């Protein structure tokens, strides 16, 4: 249709535009507008393609805007996101774990892409894990495999353990407490290491902080 195609076009146009005000508006739209149910899977398909492409362009801003757009869809009470959970998970996981999300600046930019992506996976787990069964084991196996691989960079590891940490208190106790001592000996490896420097200082501060502050409430 003309109106649905126009609003689709306008929202995609607002994703790549350097107008961070207009992309933020497009995010609000995708969480708040009714009627969008047909402009799901065209969104998601064009988001996931854009996430592939922009992983292989290192464009952190586009990647955070596409994560935020998936979150908006997932939060929109006028969109039945379930069917497309099985597409949105492996795109978001590619952002969490990716060997080429270079987080290469100021950690704030691309730590915040791994982290933001992980928070969307954490929502999706906490909302769908009960209903789907497949979902929990698929996610926990991919993140545990990353975090525990000696031979996966600091950046991939920190992403996977941030994700684990935020999935659920009962995941923290069960995966991340028993793995804690094993991963600090073997793969201290300082973060799997350099990879590290001050990003095992800030990122293994954050790991020891999020470990201390999910250890303390899983005890409590």
């Amino acid at each position: 249709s003309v109106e649905q195609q126009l609003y689709y076009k306008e929202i995609t146009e607002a994703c790549v535009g350097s107008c961070e005000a207009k992309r933020a508006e497009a995010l609000q739209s995708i969480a708040t507008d009714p009627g969008l149910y047909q402009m799901l899977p065209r969104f998601s398909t064009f988001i996931s393609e854009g996430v592939r492409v922009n992983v292989v362009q290192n464009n952190l801003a586009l990647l955070i805007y596409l994560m935020r757009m998936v979150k908006a869809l997932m939060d929109n009470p006028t969109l039945y996101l379930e069917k497309y959970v099985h597409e949105l998970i492996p795109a978001v996981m590619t952002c969490i774990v990716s060997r080429q999300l270079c987080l290469r600046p100021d950690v704030d930019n691309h730590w915040a892409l791994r982290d933001f992506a992980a928070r969307l996976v954490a929502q999706i787990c906490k909302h769908f894990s009960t209903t789907t069964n497949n979902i929990q084991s698929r996610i926990t196996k991919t993140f545990t495999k990353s975090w525990v691989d000696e031979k996966t960079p600091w950046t991939t590891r920190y992403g996977s353990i941030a994700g684990l940490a935020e999935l659920g208190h009962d995941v923290i106790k069960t995966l991340i407490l028993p793995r804690l001592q094993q991963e600090g000996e073997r793969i201290r490896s300082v973060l799997d290491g350099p990879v590290l420097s001050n990003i095992d200082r800030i990122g293994a501060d954050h790991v020891q902080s999020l470990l201390l502050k999910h250890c303390a409430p899983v005890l409590a």
């Binding site: 003309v2 126009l6 609003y7």
Partner: protein, 575 residues
């Protein structure tokens, strides 16, 4: 339509067609326009000057026949005016000058009698108003006697020819006639035509069905006399005065073969008080040989007559019948982009079925819930169409459909104020009213929908009155430049809003935008439209008492000298 303007004498508002500048022209009160310079030639494309010239040329044909006036105008085009001197210099003019004095003579020679008189009573002080009808029918003789006078209220009145035909219709509308009537007070005698001239075409084997003898109880009671239908085919262009006229209108609706009669017999069904024809003129609602406009003004009968009493909602089912004109909107409106709408059987007629509803809604204020229900379904049909050529006429006269739906719907007037909290209406109706703000307007080369969707904006914000919302579009819309249509659409609504507004400032800014806007021709358009709709009402407080407008006036005179010859008779009217 030219009759409407030729029924006007005494200050307002008629002119001659043959405008001969004679020295002794003593009556120029009503002729202000000579024919002298420039703009007085331009202004003889006004409707009287066109289609009354049309009218008189159609008459003179019938007198001088058609084959003969053919040989006339075919010679005139190829008749050569040469120039020849004695050193052999051959000149050729046709594609080169020809004269009108020899035109007169040529047609005169071929065909016709006195054309000086006849044409004199088209231009000067002639034509009639009203034809008086009275009727009789005497049983003993079988002679059906008609008394037709004629009457013309004006200085300079005469008796006139106008072939005035009457066709009487027996028990089962199976009759005949003729007549002539062309003197002032005539009584004309119509012989023992109990049996029609078409006695057995299949006309009267209709009363000769079994209504010759079974209903000889109600033919030998001739108290229902032979029903004399009046003026076929607008045979003489008068106002008829003819008591008891319901049967006459019906008989012309059903059995007349020329539809010129019909469309006028249902203008008279609309207005003159008629008993129940409603079920019978649904014949001519869907007679699929008939014009767009007779099917239209067959709906507009039921629109005008509008209930009378408290069977208001008994009309209405027949209206919503052709409110779905076989509307198949389970494939539509996605395969009505692909169709041409089948004109929807003329969208002149579809417009005036929800506008029969709307007129009825207007006229009696215990309709309005059920009409609203009706026209709510028309709104559910909308906003699913694309662009299609024919479907402009549908959209454009469905915005007149949707106007006068919210118009009665908030006709609790006292200003507009805000219409309180009728979000349900105001939102959705404005949603169709305004343009799609994503949709660019550089693509359509036409604009109809949003020409009459500023009109859907106004008139729903005129019956209450949202003043300064309306012009605050149309000023912007005549500045930006794009779209000649859109500009005029905007400027016609900026003057329809001044027609209501009566703070002095808006009229000042309106004659500023008259002055310099600076398309010259849209300048005329606005100037005439302010000259049509006056700035005063019945009261007369400081009439035409200005000093600076009269300077602008004289400065708009003799802008003929520059160009626009429809500007200076703008001045000429406001002088």
């Amino acid at each position: 339509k030219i009759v409407a303007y030729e029924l006007k004498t005494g200050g307002v508002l008629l002119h001659p067609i043959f405008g001969g500048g004679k020295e002794k022209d003593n009556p120029a009160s009503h002729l202000h326009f000579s024919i002298k310079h420039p703009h007085t030639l331009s202004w003889e494309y006004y409707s009287m000057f066109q289609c009354k010239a049309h009218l008189v040329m159609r008459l003179i044909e019938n007198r001088i026949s058609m084959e003969f006036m053919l040989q006339v105008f075919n010679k005139l085009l190829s008749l050569a005016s040469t120039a020849s001197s004695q050193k052999f210099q051959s000149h050729m003019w046709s594609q080169m000058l020809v004269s009108t004095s020899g035109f007169l003579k040529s047609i005169s020679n071929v065909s016709g009698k006195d054309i000086q008189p006849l044409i004199k009573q088209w231009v000067d002080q002639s034509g009639v108003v009203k034809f008086y009808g009275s009727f009789a029918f005497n049983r003993k003789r079988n002679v059906l006697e008609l008394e037709i006078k004629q009457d013309y209220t004006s200085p300079g009145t005469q008796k006139y020819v106008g072939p005035l035909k009457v066709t009487v219709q027996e028990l089962d509308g199976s009759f005949n006639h003729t007549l002539q009537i062309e003197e002032n007070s005539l009584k004309h005698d119509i012989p023992c035509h109990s049996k029609s001239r078409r006695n057995k075409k299949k006309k009267i084997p209709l009363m000769n069905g079994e209504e010759v003898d079974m209903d000889l109880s109600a033919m030998d009671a001739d108290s229902p006399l032979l029903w004399i239908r009046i003026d076929p085919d607008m045979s003489v262009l008068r106002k008829v005065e003819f008591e008891q006229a319901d049967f006459m209108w019906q008989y012309q609706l059903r059995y007349e073969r020329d539809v010129v009669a019909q469309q006028e017999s249902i203008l008279a069904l609309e207005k003159f008080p008629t008993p129940a024809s409603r079920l019978a003129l649904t014949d001519i609602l869907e007679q699929e040989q008939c014009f767009y406009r007779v099917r239209m003004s067959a709906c507009f009968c039921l629109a005008k007559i509008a209930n009378s009493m408290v069977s208001t909602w008994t009309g209405p089912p027949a209206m919503k019948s052709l409110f779905t004109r076989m509307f198949c909107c389970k494939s539509c409106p996605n395969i009505v982009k692909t169709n041409n709408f089948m004109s929807f059987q003329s969208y002149f007629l579809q417009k005036t079925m929800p506008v029969a509803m709307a007129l009825l809604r207007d006229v009696h204020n215990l309709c309005p819930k059920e009409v609203l229900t009706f026209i709510l379904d028309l709104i559910k049909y909308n906003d699913n169409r694309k662009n299609k050529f024919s479907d402009n006429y549908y959209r454009a006269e469905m915005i007149d459909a949707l106007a006068n739906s919210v118009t009665p719907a908030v006709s609790v007037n006292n200003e507009v104020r805000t219409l309180d909290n009728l979000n349900p209406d105001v939102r959705l109706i404005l949603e169709e009213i305004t343009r799609f703000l994503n949709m660019e307007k550089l693509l359509p080369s036409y604009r109809h929908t949003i020409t009459v969707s500023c009109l859907r904006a106004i008139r729903v914000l005129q019956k209450n009155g949202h003043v300064p919302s309306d012009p605050a579009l149309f000023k912007s819309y005549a500045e930006y430049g794009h779209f000649v249509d859109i500009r005029i659409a905007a400027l016609e609504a900026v003057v329809d809003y001044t027609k209501v507004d009566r703070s002095y400032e808006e009229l000042q800014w309106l004659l500023n935008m008259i002055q310099n806007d600076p398309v010259p021709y849209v300048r005329h358009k606005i100037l005439n439209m302010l000259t049509k709709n006056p700035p005063f009402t019945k009261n007369m407080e400081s009439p035409l008492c200005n000093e600076a407008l009269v300077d602008q006036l004289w400065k708009l005179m003799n802008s003929g000298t520059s160009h626009d010859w429809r500007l200076r008779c703008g001045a000429v009217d406001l002088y």
